[PDB]
Amino acid sequence: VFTEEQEALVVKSWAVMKKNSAELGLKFFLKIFEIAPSAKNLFSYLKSPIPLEQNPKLKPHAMTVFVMTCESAVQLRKAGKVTVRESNLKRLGAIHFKNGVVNEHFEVTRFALLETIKEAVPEMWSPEMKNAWGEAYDQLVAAIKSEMKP
Amino acid sequence: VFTEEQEALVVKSWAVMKKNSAELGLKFFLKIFEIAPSAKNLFSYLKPIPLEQNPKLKPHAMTVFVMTCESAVQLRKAGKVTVRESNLKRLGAIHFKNGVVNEHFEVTRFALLETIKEAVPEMWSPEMKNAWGEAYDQLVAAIKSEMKP
Ligand code: HEM
Ligand code: HEM
């Protein structure tokens, strides 16, 4: 069960981090690709002009993970579940399914997300901060995974 | 290709890390599973008692460190990775068979390097990272070359 304290940690830290979301997004994908460079191959549009990490579609993907994870924290506290629109969740499940996104990709992304947050707000970092973000993310991913089918 | 410094970096760091190899091997494997817990499912003997308390984690964690250091020595001496064709064929067969993919090798590389960074911070440097990464990369390339039915 996701708590008031956890929601607060995610909501506030995101309000802080959102202020520098241009470098946050690059640091996020840099960390994903540092851990698992072959994850690049999942993105069709990455082949793109060098350095390929500049690809303009990477920023909004990174930001979407951040925004929807914070949103999940709020929903988890309020409704006790992730409440993404059924039609959006279907589109998310299908596109991640057909592009061969697997558990290890979601997991590398979680680890990269938490390292990115630690790097971005060292002064707010704590084990409860890590778990708050991590648990919100896990629930978002579980909802996407429920629609990952043909 | 592989320099005397690169070799000495891998060799000397391993000598220090080896003295605590069991603690280091466990830190290493748990780091892999912190990054990607589903990697656990590749291993028939893991996927269950808590990972942190499972002695079967020891052999594979250790073999990565030991074989990677061996690779650095072989690369300096012979210009290439010198694993016996029968051992390399078995290594290729087994990783192919269990469905190990690039991302698994890459997560392991990152975990290895983070483990070493944390274990001997006094020896850590960009060159230390490069030396271990290259010895690992060359060994991995050799295993991959035999990852076939
Ligand atoms: C919280 C988890 C995630 C969320 C909320 C999310 C969000 C999104 C969104 C909104 C799109 C569609 C954007 C567009 O159509 O332009 C998308 C597509 C995509 N995402 Fe994710 N994503 C997540 C996890 C991941 C992970 C872990 C990976 C792999 C490392 C990944 C790789 C991809 C790929 C390959 C596409 C298709 C891009 C294309 O071909 O246009 N996603 N994601
Ligand atoms: C340079 C890196 C690696 C080395 C030196 C290495 C070495 C080995 C060795 C010596 C074995 C035992 C083979 C035998 O029974 O004769 C083995 C097995 C295995 N490896 Fe690796 N490995 C490496 C990378 C990886 C990675 C990245 C994964 C995936 C996370 C992986 C997964 C497995 C699995 C599932 C087995 C079979 C279970 C076992 O016998 O322990 N290996 N590996």
Breaks (C-N over 2.5 A) in chain A follow: 47
CATH no. of A1-150: 1.10.490.10
Take residue B41 and report the two structure tokens written for it. 């499912």
Report the CATH architecture of B1-149. Orthogonal Bundle (1.10)
Which ligand neighbours the alpha carbon of A35 most closely? 1
Q: How far is B48 from chain A (nearest CA, A)?
A: 19
Q: Please tell me the total number of residues recorded for chain A in this structure.
A: 150
Say whether the peptide bond before residue A150 is cis (omega within 30 degrees of 0): no
Is B56 marked within a binding site? yes
* Chain B interface includes A102 (CB < 8 A): yes
Is A105 marked within a binding site? no
Cβ atoms within 10 A of the Cβ of B110, count? Answer: 22
DSSP A99: T
Which ligand neighbours the alpha carbon of A39 most closely? 1
CA distance linking residue B111 with residue B146, whole number of Å: 24
Give CB contacts under 8 A, 24+ apart, made by B113-121: B114/B31, B115/B24, B115/B27, B115/B28, B115/B31, B116/B13, B116/B17, B118/B27, B119/B17, B119/B20, B119/B24, B119/B27, B120/B13, B120/B16, B120/B17
Q: Which helix (H) or strand (E) holds A116?
A: helix A103-120
What's the resolution in A? Answer: 1.8
DSSP A24-63: HHHHHHHHHHHH-GGGGGGSGGG--PSSGGG-TTHHHHHH
CB A121 within 8 A of CB A15: no
Q: State phi, psi for B119 to the nearest 5 degrees.
A: -75, -45
CB B136 within 8 A of CB B71: yes
- For chain B, the three-class secondary structure string (H helix, E strand, C coil) is CCCHHHHHHHHHHHHHHHCCHHHHHHHHHHHHHHHCHHHHHHCCCCCCCCHHHCHHHHHHHHHHHHHHHHHHHHHHHHCCCCCCHHHHHHHHHHHHHCCCCHHHHHHHHHHHHHHHHHHCHHHCCHHHHHHHHHHHHHHHHHHHCCCCC
Domain boundaries, chain B: 1-149
